[PDB]
Design a protein that fits this description.
The structure is a homodimer.
Chain A (H helix, E strand, L loop, with lengths): L3 H15 L4 H14 L17 H9 L16 H9 L2 E5 L4 E3 L7 E7 L2 E5 L2 E6 L4 E3 L14 E4 L3 E7 H10 L1 H14 E4 L4
Parallel strand pairs in A: 6-9
Antiparallel strand pairs in A: 1-8, 2-7, 3-6, 3-8, 4-5, 4-7
Function (chain B): Pore-forming (alpha) subunit of a voltage-gated delayed rectifier. Activates at more negative voltages, exhibits fast prepulse-independent activation kinetics and deactivates much more slowly, but shows no inactivation.
Subcellular location (chain B): Membrane
Protein name (chain B): Voltage-gated delayed rectifier potassium channel KCNH4
């Protein structure tokens, strides 16, 4: 599958190559890239299926069984709500020591671990170990504006993640207000770690 | 690069990994082409957002974006031109490819670096565009969505520069005094106004 880090790296190299940037400058950029990278800040926000007709979108949704959406959190969502959600779910490989989230960043998505392990790190202290089936996010997803993260989350091994952007998620909930009220009341039962400052 | 080719690969990648059957994949590929436009597929990530200022300045002072040579930007300060230059994206557009489909929400402003395009409404040519032309709308800083009043199609291979309205708006909030001239000056440089 795709990896955001690798996609973002190639795109960074393209940009250096198309503009004939000088070696030293390029070097500065590649090491600053890997020094400042997080999946959270580099998520894929495109939506390939948005303009497709409802019937063709339904037909696609039927072939998806996204692990993220299997959580108890979604038990009460209508079929129309689950289909929409399943069509905006993304995935990404993550490398050991690669930051999923950097403390103080604005949360851009909720993430689901399909495989691999990760550590929560606040300051220089490990707060938790995350693994297959764990949901990472925040409890106040539907306000909304900015949610400032209270810890770093770093892959410990090679990880396979799924996720939904807060933007896409909020757009969907707005079309299913009834489910949204339950979502607020239910997400915390399934939330393994909550990044909301405080 | 080509957004069209990039997005095509993405669609096919998505089809392969979920092992969708042939007939469905075909309906999806045909639907993609039927509704494709550059405007709807634009890259909206910022590669250099989290880089430090010294680095960002150094990268920017190596760029000379044609879009920014327009009279419209004559009174912009260096920091503002540097910021915009860092979020300028390029895409190639092939002959017969739509830059804009009529009715779509405008996602960016577009500058033709090379090539020529036609503006089409009800199969009628409203305008022919070429090098140096600027395509967009006038009420750019308003938060509301802009519906395009026309189709815009490449006649030859085009090389386009663009800035998302989101990025543009963010840069303009940081330079309120220039944003005011932008808003009044863009008219003189807007070759085709897509606003309803």
């Amino acid at each position: 599958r795709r990896s955001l880090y690798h996609t973002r790296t190639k795109d960074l190299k393209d940009f250096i190559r198309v503009h004939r940037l000088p070696k030293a400058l390029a070097q500065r950029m590649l090491e600053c890239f890997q020094t400042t990278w997080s999946v959270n800040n580099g998520i894929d926000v495109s939506e390939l299926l948005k303009d497709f007709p409802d019937e063709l979108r339904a037909d696609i949704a039927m072939h998806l069984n996204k692990e993220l959406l299997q959580l108890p959190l979604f038990e009460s969502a209508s079929r129309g709500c689950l289909r929409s959600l399943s069509l905006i779910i993304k995935t990404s490989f993550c490398a050991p020591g690669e930051f999923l989230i950097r403390q103080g960043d604005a949360l851009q998505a909720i993430y689901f671990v399909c495989s691999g392990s990760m550590e929560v790190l606040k300051d220089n202290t490990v707060l938790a170990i995350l693994g297959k089936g764990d949901l990472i996010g925040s409890d106040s997803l539907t306000k909304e504006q900015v949610i400032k993260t209270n810890a770093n989350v770093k892959a410990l091994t090679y990880c396979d993640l799924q996720y939904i952007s807060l933007k896409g998620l909020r757009e969907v909930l707005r079309l299913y207000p009834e489910y949204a009220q339950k979502f607020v009341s239910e997400i915390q039962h399934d939330l393994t770690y909550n990044l909301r400052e405080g």
